[PDB]
Amino acid sequence: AQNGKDLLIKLDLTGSGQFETIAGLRATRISFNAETVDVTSLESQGGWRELLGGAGVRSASISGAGVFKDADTDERARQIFFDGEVPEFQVIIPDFGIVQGPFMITSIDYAGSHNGEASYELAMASAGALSFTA
Amino acid sequence: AQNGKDLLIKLDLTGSGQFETIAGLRATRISFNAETVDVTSLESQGGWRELLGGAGVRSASISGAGVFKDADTDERARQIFFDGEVPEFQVIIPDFGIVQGPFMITSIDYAGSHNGEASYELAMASAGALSFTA
Amino acid sequence: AQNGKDLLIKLDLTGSGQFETIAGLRATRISFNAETVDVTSLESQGGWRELLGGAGVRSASISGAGVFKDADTDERARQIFFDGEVPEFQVIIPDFGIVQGPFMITSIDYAGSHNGEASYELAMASAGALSFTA
Amino acid sequence: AQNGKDLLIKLDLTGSGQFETIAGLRATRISFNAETVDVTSLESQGGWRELLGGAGVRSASISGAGVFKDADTDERARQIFFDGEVPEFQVIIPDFGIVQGPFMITSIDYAGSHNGEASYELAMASAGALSFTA
Amino acid sequence: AQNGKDLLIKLDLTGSGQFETIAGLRATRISFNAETVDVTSLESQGGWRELLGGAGVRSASISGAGVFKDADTDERARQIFFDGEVPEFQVIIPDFGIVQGPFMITSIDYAGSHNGEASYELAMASAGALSFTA
Amino acid sequence: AQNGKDLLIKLDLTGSGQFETIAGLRATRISFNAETVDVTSLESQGGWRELLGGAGVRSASISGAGVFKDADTDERARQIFFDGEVPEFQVIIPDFGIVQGPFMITSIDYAGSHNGEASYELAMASAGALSFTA
Amino acid sequence: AQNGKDLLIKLDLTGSGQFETIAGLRATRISFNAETVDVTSLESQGGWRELLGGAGVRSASISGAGVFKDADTDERARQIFFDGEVPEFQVIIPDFGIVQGPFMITSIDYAGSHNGEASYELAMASAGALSFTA
Amino acid sequence: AQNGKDLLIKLDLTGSGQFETIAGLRATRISFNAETVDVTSLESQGGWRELLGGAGVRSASISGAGVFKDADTDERARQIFFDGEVPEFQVIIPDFGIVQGPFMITSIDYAGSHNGEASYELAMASAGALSFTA
Amino acid sequence: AQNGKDLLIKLDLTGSGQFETIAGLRATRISFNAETVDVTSLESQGGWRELLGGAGVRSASISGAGVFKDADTDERARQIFFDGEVPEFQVIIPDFGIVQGPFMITSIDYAGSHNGEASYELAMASAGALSFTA
Amino acid sequence: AQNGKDLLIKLDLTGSGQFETIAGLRATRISFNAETVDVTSLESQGGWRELLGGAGVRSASISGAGVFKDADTDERARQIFFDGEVPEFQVIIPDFGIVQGPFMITSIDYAGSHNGEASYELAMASAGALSFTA
Amino acid sequence: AQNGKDLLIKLDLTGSGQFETIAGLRATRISFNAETVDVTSLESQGGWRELLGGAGVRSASISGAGVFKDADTDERARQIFFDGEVPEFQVIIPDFGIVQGPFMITSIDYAGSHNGEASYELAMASAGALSFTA
Amino acid sequence: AQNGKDLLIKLDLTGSGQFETIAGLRATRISFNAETVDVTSLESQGGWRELLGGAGVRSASISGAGVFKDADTDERARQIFFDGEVPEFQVIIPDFGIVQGPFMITSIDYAGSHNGEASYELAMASAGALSFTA
């Protein structure tokens, strides 16, 4: 078993190796996807859908949500949306290890309520090759 | 940490620098978006979806909801829908700072109930360049 | 602050100036919309989505629901669906004032239950120019 | 005010004037619709969406649900689905009066549970001209 | 009135007349459908949507869900998905009578939980002519 | 009757016959599908939708969710997403028997919360012929 | 004034008119209920909650408790729970008269103590129309 | 000071002005309620919950209990539950004056014991506008 | 009349017919339940809630409490909670006869005090068909 | 120490500054509440629940009960329920000082018994900003 | 028979085998629970609720209360709440034997009065597998 | 053993280290809580509910009640509710030591009676990290 509060997603401050967790984030998710490229012949020994595997494009989608704690790492998340770039990110699956890919911050949104805290959600998409440091 | 009741979205009364909060607004949200322009080559070192970053169009969507308090700032929100223009707006992320862009008021709607208060929601979309005053 | 039970939507009995509230209506809503006509140049000082404002078509959508009280104003709502015309309607935002536009009654529906009352919903759409009498 | 249990929808037994309520039906609804045919000129005094009114096609949709009581009127609802015809139906809005149009029974469905009763839903669509007897 | 536990859906064991209920099934539904083929003339005495009735294709959709009881009738439901055929099925509306049509088993799915029972859902579609034995 | 905790889905460690359950998985589902290829003639003895049966392509979709227990079988699930291949999988319907087909791991996603455990969902799709060992 | 020991609740022995009191019952109660179907208009001359009256479903709940005296009428109460049916019951309000409705025996429970007598409680619910013979 | 035995609740015998006390009633209570419709702005000078007052629906609940004295006024309480109507009632707060509203009798229940008297409780709910005659 | 100390609830020692009372149990209760499946039509001759009777699921709940006497029958109650099974139980209503159903031991709890004895409560739920041997 | 009979809650007679105690009130209570808005980060130095403080909405609830003494201040409590308004109230904590806020009278109820006095309870809720005069 | 003061619940001092009773504890209770996973088929020979037994999750809940005696075993109960872990506990049912499972201390609370002693309650929940040493 | 009158809960006067007991408080309680985050695998060696321990959020709830003695420490408890902040508090478990955390005062309430003293209750909730000074 493994606790969820050790599944940290990290952002670059200087753009080179200085990885810090964003802010108070309450729910986090890295989501991988494949594209299921259908190769169904005339012969499929009963008509089973045969798949190809290597050919589909693959992606990783980050989804993070939490409370607005105005750390410097949170402002470095805000500004890389503005001069929209694809910096390097790092998700630590808590005892798998490090994901370490570049991601583009597609959607950032700051929400508040009269009776609640200021909360931000944060969604990112894969921008390049992913790795696995362990 | 930071309270949500200091995330104010402001509207122009005279159209030039006179920024006031709209009315009793109970939930507010500024939502940013990118367009994820896919550049996936023949070579992607395993088939990872490569993204471009700078090329996608970017947007900001305001979503505000609250109780109908018939302030002058609320009527100035109503009339700019009618002679539909793109005036300047200002969202204050509570200790980031000022957003300060022009927005078009796409959807305004006044709702009431027999056992409830009169409530308005308010949705706006980006009309131009956004800034960050801090 | 302002109560929701003073947000009355009114219908014409004679088709000329004789405006009455429909029936026992429990929830009412006038909903305005713009069309967000995108004008995004090659140059947008960072790629911000620029909007045009004046060009989009604009609309108003009425949504009313309530209990079936068989007033004469309710039958005048029923018959104008049948010989389908675009009579003049009037929404009173409770201390803004009068909306006063022509609307077509798109959807009317009479619903009942074995353990409930007879209820009608009522949805209308903009048929022409809107005003603001205040 | 008016009770919902007097909003009866009636079916023809002999196909000519012999109208009976279907079965134990617990929720009933007649739903009318118009088609909102858009006529938006170059000139619309501000860009308001102008509508035409008389041109859109109009419809009536019956939605009835209830418990399976195997009356003869319920079997006459079953068989007119099979040799699919458009017999005459009659909805009595409880103190408006009679609707009296022909409807096609589009969807009938008999559902049961291990811990529940046998229930049928019943959806019909307009097949011709509607009337209003009052 | 009529109990829902007498609405049995039956499957063929030998493919010829030997009809048995599947397994422990907790919710069952046979759902019929018509296609509402629109015939709206230039003249429709007010613009009412006129329908044709006999022309639309008609269908029957079975939906069954329940607990996985590994009867022989359940394995005969599994194997007819594999060598995908259209065997004869029988729904008994509890005091209407017998439906008796051929159906193709489109979707079968076996689901389990760590704290629950093993449950299967089962969805079928019409494969031919339907009858009514009563 | 049959317990749900004996519906195990198994993954290959060495790619050849060494089948182990993934991790702590809390909900599991194998979902089969057919394609309902419509063959509706001009003659269908009343207009019943006739189906063909053998012609539609057929598929199996695995859906597994559970807690992140970092077993070696869980890392072997992670890596086969990366060098995306179609290894052999095995679902044991608890007293039917073995499913034993090749599947591609389309979607894997590792999710955590500040107050919850680290959880993974896991969705797979059919990559070839399915069997039934019993 | 009127004594409570003349408020007898009676059960059918043969299912047809042969009504006998159950056993030694020490406390008895017939409880009627309405459903308070809310019809609150936009206008209610001050906002008073207006009710409809005729539309709500109505029920009768029997509650009987007493000592286990193993009469034949007590065993006829036990067996109608097992082959669960809705036989006819009769409550005699002592100088109103007879209630005479069908009731389903929802809850029967036989309780004993080491220092007490064997006691049964008995709760029933309305199964149909109620009457009043007086 | 004021005695409680002069707080009489009265029922209509003929339905028009003929008001009599029910029976031997030992405890009586008229209970009024408001709905506390929350209007809490973004600004509330410290975050105090601001309320609206006029908008909430208001109700009156009668609760009466006593001994079963089989007066004609008690039978007129019984029968108006059966053909469930909303007759006019009258509570006399002993030196305020008269309440005089219509009420629906939601719950009536006749209870007896082997060692006690026959007792009835009686609960009513507001059905319309309330007054105050004094 | 009948004593409560002859209302014995019995447990299986060998799992086959060897029924013994548990321990010193001071209060015992078998509680039966039905599910009151509501079938309320549009017509109910006044709006009486009509019930169905045969369709509701039925259950039996055992509740036993007493002093901890460490008999072998008490340890056989403890262990069947651990390897959680549904063995056969037997309640003897003292001159009705035998209940004889299978029950699952849902809740067992051993409680002690500094000034009291060691006491256990014991709650069971129906696991299958119930009988009545008499 | 301080006596409880000097904790007076006062009502406005003229609506402006004329504050009087209601009637014979036997138990009184002003109850304040906060909303505990949870801000629990990913990091909380051990997982302690961190709170925000300023963001939660705050309220004050009056609860008063006593004997019905028909003073003019008691009738001014009755009538402000009817034309439901939010007048100004004043609680004197006996040597703190004055509370002085506006409150809505949510629940008033007049109760009497055959052997008791006429008693009223009285519950109010916060309608706006609270103060502290001391 | 067996005394309650020999039902000791024991805590680990070193985390490995060194089990001591907590403090002066006046009332203690270990409470076991099952989850009653319902498997009710279409056929249940009369509609009896059939249960599954092996599938439900099972738990053990400790409830201990007593006087605050500041032993070292009491401080070892306090600190394992702070760095919240799941250490091993041991309940000795006095002549059954040893329970010996890991438990998480969910709720600890220290209470005192001006005229009473300092008392602590203590509630724990099952964290893993339970045993039975006897 | 240890007396309850040495379990003092202390409040800050200046907000920095100046800790005093509130007032005459008659009953006091600090209550800790964990969140029992369930991690129940497919395998749990018999189906025991396995828990995670470190992941659940943890809290501390103060409950204090007593007589209104208008000390300066009592007014400092009143005012920190008004400008609602999260000051530092200190509970002294009498020979454990000091708790020393920040708490928000959720509920304060001043109650009085005609024959009793003025009493206040006081409930607080955890606002941050807790400590243990001993």
Numbering used by the authors:
A (entry chain B), B (entry chain B), C (entry chain B), D (entry chain B), E (entry chain B), F (entry chain B), ...: 3 to 136
What does the paper say about this structure?
The genes encoding proteins that form Rhodobacter capsulatus GTA particles (RcGTA) are derived from phage DNA, which has been integrated into the bacterial genome. Here, we use cryo-electron microscopy (cryo-EM) to determine the structures of RcGTA before and after DNA ejection, and to visualize the interactions of RcGTA with R. capsulatus cells.
The RcGTA tail contains five discs of tail tube proteins (major tail proteins) (Rcc01691, g9), which are organized as a six-entry helix with a twist of 24.4° and pitch of 38.3 Å. The long loop of the tail tube protein mediates interactions between the tail tube proteins from successive discs and between the tail tube protein and distal tail protein. The structure of tail tube did not reveal any changes after DNA ejection, suggesting that the tail is not involved in signaling to trigger DNA ejection after attachment to a cell.
